Amino acid sequence: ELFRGVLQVSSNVLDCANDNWWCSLLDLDTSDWEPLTHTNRLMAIYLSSVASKLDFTGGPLAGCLYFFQVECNKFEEGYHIHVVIGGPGLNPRNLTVCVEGLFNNVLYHLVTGNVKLKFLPGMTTKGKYFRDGEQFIENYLMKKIPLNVVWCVTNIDGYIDTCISATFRRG
C-alpha cells in the first residue's frame, strides 16, 4: 500500500535556478535514455538530489518506499512530479507536510529566492487518500517512454534498474 500525489514545478521555479543547480556535477545514467539537456536536465538533477536526501532521512520518512517520476506539463509550461510513496511512518495526516518539507528542503539549495512547491495528494472527492500507488506505477507511470517521462528515481526492488530503462518501458 503506497500513497500517491503530484507536485508542480512552474517555469518561474526554473527561472530562479542558481548556478549550483545548473553546474551540477551529477552524472546520470542515460545510456538507455534520451539526452538530458536544458531544463529537462535540471529536473533530472532535482529528482536525483531529492532521492539521495530521502535515502538518508529518518523520522516519518524512515524506511519508506518511493517512486518519483517527472514529466512535462502538456498544456502549460513547466513540469509535474509524480510521487508514489509509503512507509511505516507515513499516514494521511502527515503525508503532505512530510513530502512538501522534503521536496522544498532540497529545492531551497537550488533556487536564488524563496520558492515553494505544493504537494496535492491523490484522493477521492470525499477525501479518502489513494492507496493504489503500486498499481499506478505499473499501469501508468512505467509505460511512458522518454521524453514523455523526463526522469525517474525509485528505491522499490522491482524498478531499481528498469525505472530509467527506455527499452524496458517500451516492451
Author numbering: 2 to 172
Paper text:
The nuclease domain of NS1 (NS1_Nuc) is responsible for DNA Ori binding and nicking that is critical for B19V viral DNA replication. NS1 contains one nuclease domain (Nuc, aa 1–176), one helicase domain (aa 302–457) and one transactivation domain (TAD, aa 523–531). NS1 belongs to the HUH-endonuclease superfamily and it shares conserved ssDNA cleavage mechanism with other HUH-endonuclease members. NS1_Nuc is of α/β fold in nature.
Totally, two NS1_Nuc structures (Form I and Form II) were solved. The Form II structure belongs to P21 space group. It was refined to 2.2-Å resolution with final Rwork and Rfree of 22.3 % and 25.8 %, respectively. Different from the Form I structure, there are two NS1_Nuc molecules within the asymmetric unit of the Form II structure. Superposition showed that the overall folding of NS1_Nuc is very similar in the two structures; the root mean square deviation (RMSD) value is 0.8 Å, based on 169 pairs of Cα atoms. The conformations of the α-helices and -strands are well conserved, but NS1_Nuc does show some conformational changes, especially in the βlinker and β4-β5 linker regions. Compared to the Form II structure, Glu77 is shifted about 7.3 Å in the Form I structure. As observed in the Form I and Form II NS1_Nuc structures, Leu121 can adopt two different conformations, but neither are compatible with A-5 in the WDV Rep/ssDNA complex structure. However, as supported by the clear 2Fo-Fc electron density maps, Arg94 is well defined and adopts similar conformations in our NS1_Nuc structures. The β4-α5linker contains two highly conserved Lys residues, Lys127 and Lys129. Different from Arg94, both Lys127 and Lys129 can undergo subtle conformational changes.
